[PDB]
């Protein structure tokens, strides 16, 4: 018999992005080919199968720095981190391959699906 | 020129609630008249003007335990904490006064608004 507030989830995510932009309560640095990205472990886990696996690990859950595979492109990661905190994906002809490869590595199934569809349309 | 994934914010919140239910990466205990509630500081801040003020304070941001005012009802708090993580509010004739009082104290403007409207309809 609950009532539901339609905009609540969007409002929560908007506030989480405001905390990220002001670097409030960020608890991890993700290192991608020397570029560094500060974020909230919980948001990373909520969006990515890879971060979910990393931060549920009894040793890795305590790490303040995570280094990604050197094949990961920092721009592709940045676009995906922005998507995690906003639901908006900056998908362009010039970045689609790097975004898809990064989303496959991060295990972000819905992003992988839209990249596959956009690539299939161009062939 | 971004594309947007409609269900992303809802999916993020659903995963944050799964982490709460399994007590994963919870970093604060909220004490309400001896009852204890574990939660994520970022989610509390994203939902409440009171928690936002508390955890942006340079001394309080480091506290692992927060004690609420003794006038706060634990059931009212529990219903509001559930709403924070799900967008669903269990508003009933028997709890509406305690829920409204708790939402006013927590500074959850949209909850206060619906309680005021539901109370006005019953008079």
């Amino acid at each position: 018999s609950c009532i539901q507030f339609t905009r609540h989830a969007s409002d929560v995510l908007l506030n989480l992005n405001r905390l990220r932009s002001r670097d409030i309560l960020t608890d991890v640095v993700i290192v991608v080919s020397r570029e560094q990205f500060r974020a909230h472990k919980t948001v990373l886990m909520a969006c990515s199968g890879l971060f979910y696996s990393i931060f549920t690990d009894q040793l890795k859950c305590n790490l303040s720095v995570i280094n990604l595979d050197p094949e990961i492109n920092p721009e592709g990661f940045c676009i995906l981190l922005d998507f995690m905190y906003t639901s908006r994906l900056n998908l362009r002809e010039g970045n689609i391959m790097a975004v898809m490869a990064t989303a496959m590595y991060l295990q972000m199934e819905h992003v992988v699906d839209t990249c596959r569809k956009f690539i299939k349309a161009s062939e | 020129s971004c594309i947007q994934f409609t269900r992303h914010a809802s999916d993020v919140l659903l995963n944050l609630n799964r982490l709460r239910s399994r007590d994963i990466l919870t970093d604060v205990v909220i004490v309400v008249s001896r009852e204890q509630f574990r939660a994520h500081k970022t989610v509390l801040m994203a939902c409440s003007g009171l928690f936002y003020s508390i955890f942006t304070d340079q001394l309080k941001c480091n506290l692992s335990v927060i004690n609420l005012d003794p006038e706060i009802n634990p059931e009212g708090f529990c219903i509001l904490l559930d709403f924070m993580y799900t967008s669903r509010l269990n508003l009933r004739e028997g709890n509406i006064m305690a829920v409204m009082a708790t939402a006013m104290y927590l500074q959850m403007e949209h909850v206060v608004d619906t309680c005021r409207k539901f109370i006005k309809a019953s008079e």
């Binding site: 609950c2 009532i3 539901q4 507030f5 339609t6 | 669903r88 509010l89 619906t114």
Partner: peptide, 4 residues
């Protein structure tokens, strides 16, 4: 607010 809605009935979910």
């Amino acid at each position: 607010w809605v009935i979910p």
